[PDB]
Amino acid sequence: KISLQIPIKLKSVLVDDWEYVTKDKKICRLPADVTVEMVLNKYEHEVSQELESPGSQSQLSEYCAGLKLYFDKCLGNMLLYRLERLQYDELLKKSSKDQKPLVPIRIYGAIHLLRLISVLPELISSTTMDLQSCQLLIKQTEDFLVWLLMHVDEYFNDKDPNRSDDALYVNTSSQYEGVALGM
Amino acid sequence: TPKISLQIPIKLKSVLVDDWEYVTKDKKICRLPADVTVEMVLNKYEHEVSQELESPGSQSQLSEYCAGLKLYFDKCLGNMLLYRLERLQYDELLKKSSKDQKPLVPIRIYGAIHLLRLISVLPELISSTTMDLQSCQLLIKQTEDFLVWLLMHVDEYFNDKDPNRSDDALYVNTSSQYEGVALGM
Amino acid sequence: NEEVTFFEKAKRYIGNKHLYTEFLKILNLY
Amino acid sequence: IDFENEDFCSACNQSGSFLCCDTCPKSFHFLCLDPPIDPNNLPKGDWHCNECKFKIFINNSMATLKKIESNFIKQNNNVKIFAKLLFNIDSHNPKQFQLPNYIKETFPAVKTGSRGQYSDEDENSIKYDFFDKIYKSKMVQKRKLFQFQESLIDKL
Amino acid sequence: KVWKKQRLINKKNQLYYEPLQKIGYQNNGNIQIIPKITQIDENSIKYDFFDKIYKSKMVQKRKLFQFQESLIDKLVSN
Ligand SMILES: [Zn+2]
Ligand SMILES: [Zn+2]
Q1: Please, are residues B116 and B12 in contact by the beta-carbon 8 Å criterion?
Q2: Which of A158, B54, D11, D82 is buried most deeply by CB count within 10 Å?
Q3: CB pairs under 8 A between D and E
Q4: Can you give the residue range of the structural domain that contains B37?
Q5: What CA–CA distances, in Å, run from A46 to A10, A12, A140, A182, D58?
Q6: What spacing in Å lies between the alpha carbon of D12 and ligand 1's midpoint?
Q7: How far is CA E25 from CA B123, E2, E20, in A?
Q8: Does the CB of D100 have a partner CB in chain B at under 8 Å?
Q9: Number of domains in chain A
Q10: Closest in C3, C4, C28 to E45, CB measured
């Protein structure tokens, strides 16, 4: 059984998200200010500025490309609560309206990527991957999680969207609960 | 656990190197008992700072640190504060404290020079203990403020007034017996 | 001096321990 | 295991007449011990350095170490700032005096030898609130004197 | 600005750290009272509170004093 060691503060962030996107009936304001494209690009860039060996930088950019592709292939399938899907669906529809396909990497914020990471242990447990590759990927994601734990005060601040503006979350209307939650 | 430094003033370093040359090259020893004890200097620093601090917590911290530095002078003068030669004089007081049946109270004898020595050694000491970062910074700020206050009194406690008057000279030439143990004979 | 007496008065008035703990936590949060 | 004791007194890294510990290879000059031991009256029996004494006292149990250091901090609640540091003194052996490296490099004309030669080329709360109020009164009085000075100089 | 009280991270993995400096600590709003969650005692809170009160009193006094000195300067300017 593959195991990942999330920092405790990121666990607190995930549990507060569980709070907000559940019975406070909030959703994530989209397209978020800092997406997964920008976050993974800045992480890869800063860490490459430190990496000396070429193989290390190759593995870094490889894992980053892979994680972007898993965002694109996973946000819709397994990373959305039941309450949020309508939003996503709405955006999907808007895509079909403008003939610009939907790739979530450029729209959705870091929190859904963190949800993906959280699930990633089970995903890799559903594999036939070899042990060393799995451990390499786990170590890469753990270094990323340490980076995120340093930047969790630039990324994951709370703002109480009921009183100022532009928070990491926004409220839903009664029609939204009606259609999304209780169809 | 941390890495920490004291911005020691340069004149105190000059006094330290002068003391080193006096004890190690000129073969001199500090006059014991010193005319100004460590009780007196620490008490005067505490009493002159206590009249300038507003809030009660700052003064509680001042007094706690002063009493702690007194206890550390006591517990460290016999351990790390003396060169090879001076230990003899120390053991000398030992014998005296042995004959009087009085426990040795190092603070009531020595002068501000050994306190300066202990303060200069303090960084490695505090670096070798597991004190948290905030208490470490507090200790360091206290010590640096005390060092600035002492630098303000650099002459009253460290300057050799009138080297023609042996009665007030801080360092006295060691007897022929002291060099006997100094050369290991 | 008299503020020590104020804190003693507060501990007397609140009476219960848990409520005094909550009072001190209010004071420290301030 | 009969280990060889170091021919240098670990407190002064010098050779001479020194007493050695039977549980550690460290030997120490009679003048370097705390308190300095008289070569005429030697401690009868097995003698150990401070480190060995503290070790055999704590019986190599880290839980006892933490318990005793916590109690020592709890008892030193008037000098709490130093408490932890204090618990370290009575455990470790002594050494002679050497200034830190950055003090060695302040002036260029001084150089270091290998032998250590350095050559040139409650009631307290009442008292504290009282000090608070008295200093406050003093400084507000000084401010009133500031105002008096300004008024007298400007009226003329 | 927002919360000062963290979550209750049990499973017995919480760090209780009794500080060695008690009169000028800041440390959290995550206090625990005894006779990283940092323990504390009544007298420490007493001293922090009175420190706050007296520092604030001196601050207000100095504000009023700056106001009065600016006022007397502009007054003699007339
Ligand atoms: Zn020796
Ligand atoms: Zn030993």
Answers
A1: yes
A2: D82
A3: 28
A4: 4-185
A5: 21, 26, 14, 45, 48
A6: 4
A7: 21, 20, 9
A8: yes
A9: 1
A10: C28
